[PDB]
Short mmCIF file of C-alpha atoms and ligand atoms in Angstrom, two decimals:
data_model
loop_
_atom_site.label_atom_id
_atom_site.label_comp_id
_atom_site.label_asym_id
_atom_site.label_seq_id
_atom_site.Cartn_x
_atom_site.Cartn_y
_atom_site.Cartn_z
CA UNK A 21 104.77 76.84 96.94
CA UNK A 22 105.40 80.33 96.75
CA UNK A 23 102.93 83.21 97.32
CA UNK A 24 102.34 86.97 97.74
CA UNK A 25 103.38 88.36 101.10
CA UNK A 26 100.84 91.16 100.91
CA UNK A 27 97.36 91.19 99.42
CA UNK A 28 97.33 87.50 98.71
CA UNK A 29 93.78 87.47 99.45
CA UNK A 30 92.25 90.54 97.55
CA UNK A 31 90.73 88.21 94.83
CA UNK A 32 90.07 85.68 97.52
CA UNK A 33 87.68 88.26 99.32
CA UNK A 34 85.91 89.87 96.09
CA UNK A 35 83.10 88.77 93.94
CA UNK A 36 84.02 86.60 91.25
CA UNK A 37 82.92 89.04 89.12
CA UNK A 38 85.81 91.41 90.21
CA UNK A 39 88.36 89.12 88.53
CA UNK A 40 86.53 86.94 86.05
CA UNK A 41 87.20 88.89 83.23
CA UNK A 42 86.17 86.50 80.65
CA UNK A 43 82.60 86.77 81.67
CA UNK A 44 83.02 90.47 80.93
CA UNK A 45 80.17 91.71 78.24
CA UNK A 46 81.94 94.90 76.35
CA UNK A 47 79.61 97.54 75.79
CA UNK A 48 81.02 99.60 72.63
CA UNK A 49 81.06 102.97 72.30
CA UNK A 50 80.95 105.26 69.37
CA UNK A 51 83.86 104.85 67.01
CA UNK A 52 83.44 108.18 65.50
CA UNK A 53 83.49 110.29 68.67
CA UNK A 54 87.25 109.97 68.34
CA UNK A 55 89.46 111.11 65.50
CA UNK A 56 93.23 110.29 65.25
CA UNK A 57 95.73 113.59 65.07
CA UNK A 58 98.96 111.74 64.94
CA UNK A 59 101.01 108.48 65.66
CA UNK A 60 102.91 108.77 68.81
CA UNK A 61 103.75 105.09 69.67
CA UNK A 62 103.75 101.82 68.34
CA UNK A 63 104.57 98.20 69.74
CA UNK A 64 103.63 94.53 68.90
CA UNK A 65 100.37 94.76 70.21
CA UNK A 66 99.33 97.92 69.08
CA UNK A 67 99.70 101.58 67.58
CA UNK A 68 98.99 104.31 69.76
CA UNK A 69 97.86 108.05 68.62
CA UNK A 70 97.17 111.32 70.15
CA UNK A 71 93.48 111.84 69.23
CA UNK A 72 90.79 114.18 69.83
CA UNK A 73 87.26 113.80 71.16
CA UNK A 74 85.12 115.09 68.64
CA UNK A 75 82.33 115.83 70.93
CA UNK A 76 84.42 118.05 73.74
CA UNK A 77 87.25 118.76 71.33
CA UNK A 78 89.76 117.62 74.46
CA UNK A 79 92.61 115.59 74.08
CA UNK A 80 92.96 111.54 74.15
CA UNK A 81 95.06 108.78 73.58
CA UNK A 82 93.58 105.96 70.89
CA UNK A 83 95.13 102.81 71.19
CA UNK A 84 94.46 100.58 68.14
CA UNK A 85 94.79 96.96 68.83
CA UNK A 86 96.34 94.34 66.73
CA UNK A 87 94.75 91.26 66.29
CA UNK A 88 94.63 88.96 69.60
CA UNK A 89 92.46 86.69 71.32
CA UNK A 90 88.92 87.99 72.73
CA UNK A 91 90.22 86.69 76.11
CA UNK A 92 93.24 88.88 76.45
CA UNK A 93 91.56 92.07 75.29
CA UNK A 94 88.64 91.59 78.11
CA UNK A 95 91.43 91.09 80.46
CA UNK A 96 92.97 94.47 79.77
CA UNK A 97 89.62 96.06 79.97
CA UNK A 98 88.95 94.52 82.95
CA UNK A 99 91.94 95.50 84.92
CA UNK A 100 91.65 99.26 83.16
CA UNK A 101 88.09 99.30 84.50
CA UNK A 102 88.93 97.93 87.95
CA UNK A 103 91.97 100.27 88.21
CA UNK A 104 90.08 103.53 86.72
CA UNK A 105 90.95 106.24 89.12
CA UNK A 106 93.74 104.84 90.99
CA UNK A 107 96.94 106.95 91.80
CA UNK A 108 98.64 107.59 88.30
CA UNK A 109 96.82 104.98 86.68
CA UNK A 110 96.29 105.78 83.14
CA UNK A 111 92.60 106.54 82.70
CA UNK A 112 90.26 104.31 80.36
CA UNK A 113 87.70 106.56 78.76
CA UNK A 114 86.11 104.54 76.32
CA UNK A 115 86.01 101.60 74.07
CA UNK A 116 85.33 101.24 70.33
CA UNK A 117 85.45 99.12 67.57
CA UNK A 118 86.07 99.22 63.41
CA UNK A 119 82.51 97.66 62.36
CA UNK A 120 84.14 96.32 59.34
CA UNK A 121 87.18 94.62 60.52
CA UNK A 122 86.29 94.68 63.96
CA UNK A 123 89.59 96.29 64.75
CA UNK A 124 89.12 97.36 68.56
CA UNK A 125 90.41 100.56 70.05
CA UNK A 126 90.85 101.90 73.45
CA UNK A 127 90.36 105.26 74.44
CA UNK A 128 92.40 106.99 77.06
CA UNK A 129 92.57 110.42 78.72
CA UNK A 130 95.60 112.33 77.33
CA UNK A 131 99.32 112.75 78.90
CA UNK A 132 102.09 114.86 77.16
CA UNK A 133 104.87 112.44 77.76
CA UNK A 134 108.73 112.95 76.75
CA UNK A 135 110.76 110.08 75.34
CA UNK A 136 112.76 108.57 78.37
CA UNK A 137 115.70 108.25 76.42
CA UNK A 138 116.21 112.00 76.12
CA UNK A 139 114.41 113.00 79.23
CA UNK A 140 116.31 110.81 81.94
CA UNK A 141 119.30 112.11 81.21
CA UNK A 142 118.19 115.51 82.37
CA UNK A 143 116.35 114.63 85.72
CA UNK A 144 117.94 115.64 88.65
CA UNK A 145 118.55 113.61 91.83
CA UNK A 146 115.40 114.79 93.42
CA UNK A 147 113.36 114.30 90.15
CA UNK A 148 114.36 110.44 90.14
CA UNK A 149 113.09 110.30 93.90
CA UNK A 150 110.07 112.07 93.14
CA UNK A 151 108.86 110.05 89.94
CA UNK A 152 110.32 106.51 91.10
CA UNK A 153 107.88 107.59 94.23
CA UNK A 154 104.99 108.45 92.06
CA UNK A 155 105.38 105.21 90.05
CA UNK A 156 105.49 103.46 93.11
CA UNK A 157 102.00 104.77 94.22
CA UNK A 158 100.46 103.41 91.10
CA UNK A 159 102.45 99.78 91.98
CA UNK A 160 101.11 99.73 95.39
CA UNK A 161 97.94 100.58 94.15
CA UNK A 162 97.11 97.95 91.52
CA UNK A 163 98.75 95.33 93.61
CA UNK A 164 96.27 96.36 96.59
CA UNK A 165 93.68 95.93 93.81
CA UNK A 166 94.96 92.10 93.39
CA UNK A 167 96.42 93.06 89.96
CA UNK A 168 100.10 92.65 88.62
CA UNK A 169 101.26 94.82 86.12
CA UNK A 170 103.99 92.43 84.60
CA UNK A 171 105.69 94.68 82.09
CA UNK A 172 107.01 98.04 84.13
CA UNK A 173 109.60 99.42 82.02
CA UNK A 174 110.22 103.53 81.01
CA UNK A 175 108.16 102.87 77.96
CA UNK A 176 105.11 102.00 80.11
CA UNK A 177 105.86 104.98 82.26
CA UNK A 178 104.37 108.14 80.49
CA UNK A 179 105.76 111.26 82.34
CA UNK A 180 104.84 114.98 81.52
CA UNK A 181 107.87 116.48 82.64
CA UNK A 182 106.23 120.09 82.33
CA UNK A 183 103.27 119.23 84.96
CA UNK A 184 105.43 116.86 86.67
CA UNK A 185 102.58 114.42 86.10
CA UNK A 186 103.18 110.49 85.78
CA UNK A 187 101.06 107.61 84.49
CA UNK A 188 101.63 103.78 84.59
CA UNK A 189 100.22 102.56 80.88
CA UNK A 190 99.83 99.59 79.01
CA UNK A 191 97.98 96.98 81.24
CA UNK A 192 97.80 94.60 78.16
CA UNK A 193 99.91 92.01 79.93
CA UNK A 194 98.69 92.61 83.54
CA UNK A 195 97.03 90.05 85.24
CA UNK A 196 94.69 89.12 88.36
CA UNK A 197 97.01 87.27 91.34
CA UNK A 198 95.38 84.10 92.58
CA UNK A 199 97.35 82.36 95.50
CA UNK A 200 99.44 79.25 94.07
CA UNK A 201 98.34 79.98 90.53
CA UNK A 202 101.07 79.14 87.63
CA UNK A 203 101.19 82.15 85.12
CA UNK A 204 102.90 82.37 81.85
CA UNK A 205 106.54 83.42 82.61
CA UNK A 206 106.20 84.95 78.87
CA UNK A 207 105.79 88.44 80.35
CA UNK A 208 107.49 91.88 80.63
CA UNK A 209 110.16 93.10 78.29
CA UNK A 210 113.90 91.20 78.44
CA UNK A 211 115.82 93.77 80.19
CA UNK A 212 113.32 94.07 82.89
CA UNK A 213 112.51 90.24 83.28
CA UNK A 214 112.95 89.21 87.01
CA UNK A 215 114.95 85.93 87.84
CA UNK A 216 111.60 84.41 88.52
CA UNK A 217 110.82 84.30 84.45
CA UNK A 218 114.08 83.63 83.42
CA UNK A 219 114.10 80.29 85.56
CA UNK A 220 110.83 79.19 84.96
CA UNK A 221 109.41 79.75 88.18
CA UNK A 222 105.58 80.26 87.26
CA UNK A 223 103.97 80.90 90.72
CA UNK A 224 105.11 84.46 90.92
CA UNK A 225 103.45 87.55 92.19
CA UNK A 226 103.29 91.14 92.95
CA UNK A 227 106.94 90.97 93.53
CA UNK A 228 107.70 90.68 89.87
CA UNK A 229 106.76 94.31 89.10
CA UNK A 230 109.55 95.13 91.84
CA UNK A 231 112.29 93.45 90.23
CA UNK A 232 111.26 95.52 87.09
CA UNK A 233 111.31 98.82 88.85
CA UNK A 234 114.81 98.19 90.44
CA UNK A 235 116.16 97.65 86.84
CA UNK A 236 114.59 101.04 85.99
CA UNK A 237 115.77 102.78 89.15
CA UNK A 238 119.11 101.09 88.77
CA UNK A 239 119.44 102.54 84.99
CA UNK A 240 118.32 106.00 86.12
CA UNK A 241 121.22 106.43 89.04
CA UNK A 242 123.68 104.72 87.11
CA UNK A 243 122.91 106.70 84.01
CA UNK A 244 123.05 103.31 81.89
CA UNK A 245 119.89 102.05 79.70
CA UNK A 246 119.31 99.47 80.20
CA UNK A 247 120.98 98.28 83.19
CA UNK A 248 121.06 94.44 82.67
CA UNK A 249 121.58 94.33 78.94
CA UNK A 250 121.18 90.98 77.38
CA UNK A 251 120.12 89.78 73.92
CA UNK A 252 117.94 86.66 74.58
CA UNK A 253 116.45 85.34 78.08
CA UNK A 254 119.49 83.02 78.31
CA UNK A 255 121.63 86.18 77.97
CA UNK A 256 119.60 88.31 80.30
CA UNK A 257 119.98 85.57 83.20
CA UNK A 258 123.70 85.83 82.65
CA UNK A 259 123.91 89.72 82.81
CA UNK A 260 122.35 89.44 86.30
CA UNK A 261 124.39 86.74 87.69
CA UNK A 262 127.49 88.54 86.61
CA UNK A 263 126.45 91.64 88.82
CA UNK A 264 124.32 89.76 91.92
CA UNK A 265 126.93 86.83 91.75
CA UNK A 266 126.16 83.19 91.47
CA UNK A 267 125.98 82.17 95.16
CA UNK A 268 122.65 84.02 95.21
CA UNK A 269 121.41 82.61 92.35
CA UNK A 270 122.35 78.85 93.53
CA UNK A 271 120.69 79.53 96.77
CA UNK A 272 117.59 80.97 95.24
CA UNK A 273 117.23 77.91 92.99
CA UNK A 274 117.87 75.49 96.23
CA UNK A 275 115.21 77.41 98.13
CA UNK A 276 112.49 76.85 95.32
CA UNK A 277 113.86 73.69 94.50
CA UNK A 278 114.55 74.72 90.77
CA UNK A 279 116.70 72.85 88.32
CA UNK A 280 118.26 75.28 85.81
CA UNK A 281 118.40 74.00 82.25
CA UNK A 282 122.07 72.47 81.22
CA UNK A 283 122.70 75.18 78.77
CA UNK A 284 121.49 77.91 80.86
CA UNK A 285 123.44 76.56 83.77
CA UNK A 286 126.42 76.51 81.50
CA UNK A 287 126.00 80.25 80.08
CA UNK A 288 125.84 81.26 83.81
CA UNK A 289 128.85 79.71 85.11
CA UNK A 290 130.19 81.20 88.05
CA UNK A 291 130.44 84.69 89.33
CA UNK A 292 131.37 86.53 92.21
CA UNK A 293 128.96 89.46 93.57
CA UNK A 294 129.67 92.92 92.12
CA UNK A 295 129.16 95.92 94.65
CA UNK A 296 126.96 98.27 93.55
CA UNK A 297 129.53 101.04 93.77
CA UNK A 298 131.75 99.45 91.01
CA UNK A 299 129.21 101.05 88.64
CA UNK A 300 129.60 104.69 89.79
CA UNK A 301 131.39 107.08 87.47
CA UNK A 302 132.21 110.69 86.80
CA UNK A 303 128.60 110.57 84.73
CA UNK A 304 126.33 109.27 87.75
CA UNK A 305 128.08 110.08 90.96
CA UNK A 306 125.86 113.04 91.40
CA UNK A 307 122.96 110.36 91.80
CA UNK A 308 124.82 107.27 93.59
CA UNK A 309 124.42 108.48 97.04
CA UNK A 310 124.14 105.82 99.94
CA UNK A 311 120.57 105.93 100.39
CA UNK A 312 119.96 105.21 96.63
CA UNK A 313 122.41 102.08 97.25
CA UNK A 314 120.47 100.58 99.93
CA UNK A 315 117.43 101.33 98.24
CA UNK A 316 118.43 99.59 95.01
CA UNK A 317 119.77 96.75 96.69
CA UNK A 318 116.75 95.57 98.43
CA UNK A 319 114.89 95.73 94.90
CA UNK A 320 117.27 93.92 93.26
CA UNK A 321 117.08 90.43 95.02
CA UNK A 322 117.05 86.92 93.33
CA UNK A 323 114.09 85.85 95.65
CA UNK A 324 111.22 87.38 94.79
CA UNK A 325 109.98 87.16 98.61
CA UNK A 326 113.03 89.04 99.94
CA UNK A 327 112.29 92.16 97.84
CA UNK A 328 110.61 95.13 99.43
CA UNK A 329 106.96 95.67 98.63
CA UNK A 330 105.30 98.79 96.75
CA UNK A 331 104.44 100.00 100.28
CA UNK A 332 107.43 99.30 102.25
CA UNK A 333 109.58 100.84 99.14
CA UNK A 334 107.65 103.82 99.61
CA UNK A 335 108.76 104.41 102.97
CA UNK A 336 112.53 103.95 102.44
CA UNK A 337 114.30 106.96 103.82
CA UNK A 338 115.54 107.40 100.25
CA UNK A 339 112.20 109.29 99.49
CA UNK A 340 111.98 110.83 102.92
CA UNK A 341 112.07 114.53 101.16
CA UNK A 342 109.28 113.48 98.70
CA UNK A 343 107.32 112.25 101.56
CA UNK A 344 107.81 115.52 103.38
CA UNK A 345 106.75 117.90 100.55
CA UNK A 346 103.70 115.81 100.03
CA UNK A 347 102.56 115.99 103.41
CA UNK A 348 103.13 119.86 103.69
C1 P19 B 1 105.14 104.54 73.31
C2 P19 B 1 104.75 106.08 73.44
C3 P19 B 1 103.32 105.75 73.72
C4 P19 B 1 102.51 104.99 73.97
N1 P19 B 1 101.17 105.16 74.11
C5 P19 B 1 100.79 106.37 75.02
N2 P19 B 1 101.51 107.49 74.96
C6 P19 B 1 100.82 108.76 75.52
N3 P19 B 1 101.55 110.02 75.45
C7 P19 B 1 102.01 110.05 74.52
C8 P19 B 1 102.19 110.99 74.01
C9 P19 B 1 103.41 111.76 73.02
C10 P19 B 1 104.15 110.96 72.96
C11 P19 B 1 104.47 109.75 73.46
C12 P19 B 1 103.23 109.39 74.32
N4 P19 B 1 100.04 108.05 76.73
N5 P19 B 1 99.30 109.02 77.39
C13 P19 B 1 98.03 108.37 77.93
C14 P19 B 1 98.31 106.96 77.46
C15 P19 B 1 99.65 107.01 76.63
N6 P19 B 1 99.69 105.99 76.07
C16 P19 B 1 102.87 103.90 73.60
C17 P19 B 1 104.41 103.56 73.25
#
């Protein structure tokens, strides 16, 4: 019977209309107000384009959604409206649809991002602390509003390196947290899927996002994209096991009385825990300081209940200089 250690009662205390996204009655804006300038991104659920608001002539992001259930689209919209205005949360400006096809488009404030594959390698030690801290504000905020992002990964973190601005995007897989609720484990992207999803523990919570963040963080400091490189869901768990060790996994499975699929349990085998320093090399030496390791260690824990909360992560000494600069 797992439950969140923090913000567990957020949706319990708020009006049913706050979290009842299926009751939402979408108020469609004007399709023609926004025009496509250039394609900038794509995914299995949508196509993204840099656009222009014909009225004010300012930039915008046009996320054209691929065919999907009415329920899922109202969910992303409700979540975007509830989070609009929060620290580093992408800002939903409008919602429109194509009359004939009914193809919906979500309009967002613009963010001039820089592909992480090219950006990350140039980030300095301080840049990593700064940006991870900013991403942390976004997670503590959405969690405090009773929402799990469920798809934290580089591609969903827009970074304008010039203006040092950060935005957490694509809430298409986000969901409201309800104590005891059993959620679908088919969320997030494989490399950032936490153990809970890989072993079918359905009653997960905000902590799922912290494992994902931890994967991102580990990839940045160790300069290894992605950190846990698995080919399918089974292999994803195996790559994690060979690092954290199988004792921790077995302890985890016993705590939540979970039985691993015979096949999976066979693939995982048995592995000793590998110290985080064995991943250091001349390419990442200038980033793997002791504070970084202590911090990463507290994020990548099998037991989702053991992981630091977004709020705790922000106070870790690792971010001490980022906080000091902010409070100046
Ligand atoms: C991959 C890339 C972008 C998105 N969506 C996406 N892209 C951007 N900005 C952007 C601009 C230029 C190049 C890349 C991103 N933004 N900016 C705000 C929201 C958003 N969503 C989705 C997947």
